[PDB]
Point group: D2
Chain length 152, copies 4
């Protein structure tokens, strides 16, 4: 715009450890599906997103835990009629690491979750105007932290 | 289209729905004037915004009651700006309200002001700026939302 | 980083170099007051913006000379908004200036005002809004740019 | 609202009302492949975009006819980006089409390609980025618009 040839986006977060393998999907035009895994005794594990990109699906990279034992869930949204209006969860320590222990996704149609352990410090991000269009974060044994790209 | 510019709004935090207020969006923030009671919650709320390099004095949004302690948060705009807003929500006399607020800038932390009990919330901003507030105030700040931009 | 909100800006049209002006960005446009001369170019330029539902009177940016004809463009904000800005640039007394302007809204066309000779320019807006003007005025409007948003 | 993000779009330039196309918006531009004829107008048009740090190959939008000369505009992304797009529109075989295009970056000028006669247009960008193209191509590029963002 004035420095780089790369577009910018509002980003909120991170929630979780304040600094696993870092990831950054970047920003897209919407969200079609979220694939995550969790363990009821620990925290969030795997995280993957199928985005919308100008009216067609774009399959995000799978960001995988270093360990197994998680329960997978597929959140398939009725895109574009259905979209996320609130993301909430919990952070807290597992084996001495601050991690994202639970996630819940509220859309204009229903609530998905919570997934994981609803113990620790709550966080929540309601969106009154705008859309979540991207995720970044880090995953080791568990999801360490994450941030969200927001746009109009 | 609507003929009016639109911006990302996050929130509300607080009661899920006093007198509603909506400052709209500006260029940045110069000063926040709020009041609080250490037994109850946040009371009055008022903001001096930046508007294209000049101050714009926002309306004073006032609680229906008094007894609050005022505080003035004067930012060194534009080198100083808010990078995280946090606080607590919980019930006061049966009403869900914003019990405390804290504002962290790239320079220091203002607060927490109010009662630090209830459900915590926090909004860190990795990329972007807060440029406006809206919400509702009765006896106390019932809820609030924030305008975000690049 | 900057602590100040950012907006897309397109332009400038005119001289690629008077007294510079920059209104910054607002919520929308309520009224444009400009002056022109049918043998030279655009002279004075002033805008009443919308700012979160209330009018905001921009500074009057005036030519160094007189002899211009004023026109007031009062828009039915917010149902009426600009969807295309067009005009001409060309030399006057050796200076590259904005010689004419026309504003097309979703309701009507205002103009062209001034001299319709030289190099045409036009900015149709398929999605978005003009929310601010900047430029420079000496004897005539030397150049101008526009703030664009959603 | 809808579940789909939106961006500023300026245009169209060209015929006002072939096969329509719309690439949508991305995070930048890496390469433009177009074709032209120095007797007629712009023909084929294709873009390699940036999508979050990786190339995204846009569909090739093709003229119904041949006889065009291809050109590859390979930008040093992200150091190099477009700061002005300009061209001409005018009648070819009775159709209003985009007769020429030129792309100015912060490093160099590419073009003009095609026929530089008719009505000029130009879009300088003072702040922001072009991140997508849409339009229509028959025998020639009928019109086009550009997605703009910060």
């Amino acid at each position: 715009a004035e420095q780089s040839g790369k577009s910018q986006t509002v980003i909120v977060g991170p929630w979780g450890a304040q600094v696993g393998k870092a990831f950054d999907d970047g920003a897209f035009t919407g969200i079609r599906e979220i694939n995550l895994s969790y363990n009821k005794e620990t925290a969030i594990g795997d995280f993957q997103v199928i985005y919308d990109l100008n009216g067609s699906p774009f399959v995000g990279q799978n960001h995988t835990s270093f360990i197994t034992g998680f329960t997978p869930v597929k959140i398939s949204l009725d895109f574009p009629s259905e979209y996320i209006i609130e993301v909430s969860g919990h952070t807290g320590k597992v084996s001495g690491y601050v991690v994202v222990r639970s996630l819940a996704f509220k859309t204009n149609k229903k609530t998905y979750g919570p997934y994981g352990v609803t113990s620790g410090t709550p966080f929540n991000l309601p969106i009154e105007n705008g859309l979540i269009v991207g995720f970044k974060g880090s995953i080791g044994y568990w999801l360490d932290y994450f941030s969200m790209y927001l746009s109009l």
